[PDB]
């Protein structure tokens, strides 16, 4: 096939349109590149091995396109958070639509492609993190463990210090990033399972931490 076992790739989630860093575990066919890629996601072990349609797997992004090399009409992979456009989000494919540089800002606008429809004229915040989309056949396969893209969003208060105290992005009681963490639905603040007891993630669609009742 195009992509071999153990090869590092990006796999697209067909619901949200985002591409995720993943790795090829097994390759099977159905009946020509209409094959099935069995990928495990780098930082989502809980999802185990997912099956991907070949149209949704490409070689792992590696090459950054500098602001000065960005041309309008160019189709790239960049970071956007459609629910919070001022924050970091996930990795989507976009056609660059407009650039404006003034004394104070470099302004990148592009049409972000989501799950089904597109999202015209988005103001891209992360201008120094635009990836070239690897083309099939061209370019080498990624076989050595690569550096990680940053995906969001970011705790403004702990600055994602993946080694620090945080009564926000982590347990509102402690903060320990210590699969089965559960979250308020009024405050949106996260809680553990322990911090009275528990057993096996409730039926109920909603569920609560004391300060919002």
């Amino acid at each position: 096939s195009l992509y071999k076992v153990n090869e590092y790739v990006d796999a697209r989630d067909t619901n949200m349109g985002a591409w995720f860093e993943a790795q090829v575990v097994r390759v099977t066919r159905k009946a020509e590149e209409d094959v099935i890629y069995h990928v495990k996601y780098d930082d989502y072990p809980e999802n185990g091995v997912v099956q991907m349609n070949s149209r949704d797997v490409r070689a792992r992004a590696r090459t950054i396109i500098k602001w000065q090399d960005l041309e309008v009409g160019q189709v790239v992979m960049l970071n956007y958070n459609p629910d919070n456009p001022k924050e970091r989000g996930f990795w989507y494919d976009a056609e660059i639509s407009r650039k404006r540089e003034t004394r104070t800002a470099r302004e990148l606008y592009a049409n972000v492609v989501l799950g089904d429809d597109s999202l015209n004229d988005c103001r891209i915040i992360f201008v120094d993190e635009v990836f070239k989309i690897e083309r099939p056949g061209e370019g080498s396969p990624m076989v050595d463990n690569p550096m990680r893209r940053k995906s969001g969003p970011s705790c403004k208060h702990c600055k994602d210090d993946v080694n620090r105290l945080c009564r926000v992005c982590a347990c509102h009681l402690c903060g320990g990033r210590q699969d089965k963490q559960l979250m308020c639905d009024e405050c949106d603040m996260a809680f553990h399972i322990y911090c009275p007891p528990l057993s096996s993630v409730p039926s109920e669609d909603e569920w609560y931490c004391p300060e919002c009742r």
Binding site: D13, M16, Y44, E46, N81, D83, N84, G89, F90, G152, P153, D179, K180, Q181, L182, M183, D185, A190, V201, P202, S203, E204, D205, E206, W207
Partner: peptide, 10 residues
């Protein structure tokens, strides 16, 4: 029942 595994995708 909202798990921080679940929501880990905005």
């Amino acid at each position: 029942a909202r798990t921080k595994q679940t929501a880990r995708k905005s």
